[PDB]
């Protein structure tokens, strides 16, 4: 039912994915030390992941496990991204 929740997660993912994909793309191209163009993008990404994680996904359903398992994957990437960000800042 409360699957509006599982959606709210997916919308946040869509954004995280966009922003972080751009970050990685830039990050990957820049030499060293103009890598700092990615920063803006990691930040916006990180922010989307965090809003994703925040969503309480409350319910029983095999689909609901799947959503929360998704939030866990966002957690994993929130952390790796913050790590990379810090390395760049």
């Amino acid at each position: 039912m409360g699957s509006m929740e599982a959606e709210r997660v997916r919308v946040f993912h869509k954004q995280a994915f966009e922003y972080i994909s751009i970050a990685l793309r830039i990050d990957e191209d820049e030499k060293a030390g103009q890598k700092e163009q990615a920063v803006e993008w990691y930040k916006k990404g990180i922010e989307e992941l965090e809003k994703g994680i925040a969503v309480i996904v409350t319910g029983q359903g095999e689909q609901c496990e799947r959503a929360r398992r998704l939030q866990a994957k966002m957690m994993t990437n929130l952390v790796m991204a913050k790590d990379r960000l810090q390395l760049l800042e």
Binding site: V9, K14, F17, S21, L24, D27, Q63, K73, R84
Partner: protein, 40 residues
């Protein structure tokens, strides 16, 4: 509606809900994780 593997290429190159949408996001996250870990 769109084949989920199309969705993923779309999303990946910045172009153009339900249990299928979740499969998309799940796979896209895994890709992010692979992509970040490569950076080390």
């Amino acid at each position: 509606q769109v084949d989920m593997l199309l969705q993923e290429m779309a999303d990946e190159a910045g172009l153009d809900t339900g249990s299928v949408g979740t499969s998309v996001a799940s796979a896209e996250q895994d890709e992010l994780s692979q992509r970040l870990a490569r950076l080390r």
